[PDB]
Design an enzyme around this catalytic site. Structure first.
Site, PDB file in Angstrom:
ATOM      1  N   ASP A 152       0.788  -1.197  -0.144  1.00 52.36           N
ATOM      2  CA  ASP A 152      -0.037   0.101  -0.005  1.00 52.36           C
ATOM      3  C   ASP A 152       0.827   1.383  -0.116  1.00 52.36           C
ATOM      4  O   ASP A 152       0.594   2.206  -0.693  1.00 52.36           O
ATOM      5  CB  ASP A 152      -0.980   0.171   1.278  1.00 52.36           C
TER       6      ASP A 152
ATOM      7  N   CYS B 179      -2.581   0.242 -13.517  1.00 51.57           N
ATOM      8  CA  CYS B 179      -2.752   0.365 -11.720  1.00 51.57           C
ATOM      9  C   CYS B 179      -4.020   1.204 -11.661  1.00 51.57           C
ATOM     10  O   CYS B 179      -4.851   1.173 -12.218  1.00 51.57           O
ATOM     11  CB  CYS B 179      -1.233   1.085 -11.428  1.00 51.57           C
TER      12      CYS B 179
ATOM     13  N   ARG C  21       3.255   2.396 -11.032  1.00 51.09           N
ATOM     14  CA  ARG C  21       3.478   0.975 -11.293  1.00 51.09           C
ATOM     15  C   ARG C  21       3.408   0.649 -12.752  1.00 51.09           C
ATOM     16  O   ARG C  21       4.262  -0.351 -13.010  1.00 51.09           O
ATOM     17  CB  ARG C  21       2.602  -0.022 -10.518  1.00 51.09           C
ATOM     18  N   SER C  22       2.479   1.179 -13.401  1.00 50.22           N
ATOM     19  CA  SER C  22       2.389   0.744 -14.883  1.00 50.22           C
ATOM     20  C   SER C  22       3.750   1.001 -15.691  1.00 50.22           C
ATOM     21  O   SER C  22       4.266   0.337 -16.392  1.00 50.22           O
ATOM     22  CB  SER C  22       1.083   1.405 -15.550  1.00 50.22           C
TER      23      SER C  22
ATOM     24  N   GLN D   9       6.133   7.868 -10.769  1.00 50.61           N
ATOM     25  CA  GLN D   9       5.568   8.698  -9.898  1.00 50.61           C
ATOM     26  C   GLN D   9       6.491   9.396  -8.750  1.00 50.61           C
ATOM     27  O   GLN D   9       6.053  10.483  -8.224  1.00 50.61           O
ATOM     28  CB  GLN D   9       4.381   8.292  -9.365  1.00 50.61           C
TER      29      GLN D   9
END
Ligand SMILES: OCc1cc(C(F)(F)F)ccc1N1CCOCC1
EC number: 3.1.3.48
Length: 284
Positions: free
Chosen positions: A181, A215, A221-222, A262
């Site tokens: 998370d 994601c 994450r992508s 990110q």
């Protein structure tokens, strides 16, 4: 400069935040005018994450052709990816229309439906064989065929039917279920194992349409998934694998979708994954 040495030099100097901001500053800025039209407000999960006009995927319908999705075309590596947001309640039918129209074999999901106690994407696939899903707005039916649950990921076989022509296709769903998370995984071993599995399936291969990767926003994450795959493919193709510059590959990918990677921690994790990955590539 061998990226493994560049890595230790950034780590010892603790300059990850500085490198990351340099990428943010040099990244492409292209118009996203279609994404911002008022008719499309409920088709965007996040106000600050939009596809560029020049690279957006178009739905094959006259009404409204808009989806929050981009085509990333890597010319030297000979790989294409579609990067998209996690589908919303009112875009699950658009999502499956895109998979159908683009001839994709594979969907790669890097998030859980609920994380941090909030919904990160719609429940867009069926959970039981005998309870199929119908998308009336796009005329598609989706059935769960089989499910293989492993410790770090789940693979699903799905049947997508175009109710207009009664054609069917097999779609493979690759679900990475253990990204934490907060932050990034401590080791890239399970993430690399997962990429290995998507590659082995044929989903990334040129005989199919591009893989769909998502994601929640389809950039973080992508971004990490497509950056690691492309960098490892280039290290295989080149005579001097040490010539692969991960920062230059990331800036090439940012010509096609804003915001890929990110955080400074996602940038460091991407370096770690490629360094470890190549090991499994250079005879090991
Ligand atoms: O042969 C390369 C390889 C081997 C394994 C292994 F050793 F676990 F079997 C896992 C992954 C890869 N590829 C795909 C993505 O990660 C790095 C390159």
């Amino acid at each position: 400069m061998e990226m493994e040495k560049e890595f230790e030099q950034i780590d010892k100097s603790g300059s990850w935040a500085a490198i990351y901001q340099d990428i943010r500053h040099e990244a492409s800025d292209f118009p996203s005018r279609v994404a911002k039209l008022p008719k499309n407000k409920n088709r965007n999960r996040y106000r600050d994450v939009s596809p560029f006009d020049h690279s957006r995927i178009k739905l094959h319908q006259e009404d409204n052709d808009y989806i929050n999705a981009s085509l990333i075309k890597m010319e030297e590596a000979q790989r294409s990816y579609i990067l998209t947001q996690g589908p919303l309640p009112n875009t699950v039918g658009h999502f499956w229309e895109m998979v159908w129209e683009q001839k994709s074999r594979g969907v790669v999901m890097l998030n859980r439906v609920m994380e941090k106690g909030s919904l990160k994407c719609a429940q867009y696939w069926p959970q039981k064989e005998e309870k199929e899903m119908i998308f009336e707005d796009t005329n598609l039916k989706l059935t769960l065929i089989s499910e293989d649950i492993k410790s770090y990921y789940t693979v699903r076989q799905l049947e997508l039917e175009n109710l207009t022509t009664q054609e069917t296709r097999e779609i493979l769903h690759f679900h990475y279920t253990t990204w934490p998370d907060f932050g990034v995984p401590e080791s890239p071993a399970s993430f690399l194992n997962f990429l290995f599995k998507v590659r082995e399936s044929g989903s990334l291969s040129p005989e199919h349409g591009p893989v769909v990767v998502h994601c929640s926003a389809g950039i973080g994450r992508s971004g990490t998934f497509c950056l690691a795959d492309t960098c490892l493919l280039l290290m295989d193709k080149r005579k001097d694998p040490s010539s692969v510059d991960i920062k230059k590959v990331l800036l090439e990918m940012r010509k096609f979708r804003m915001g890929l990677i990110q955080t400074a921690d996602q940038l460091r994790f991407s370096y770690l994954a490629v360094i470890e990955g190549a090991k499994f590539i250079m005879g090991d």
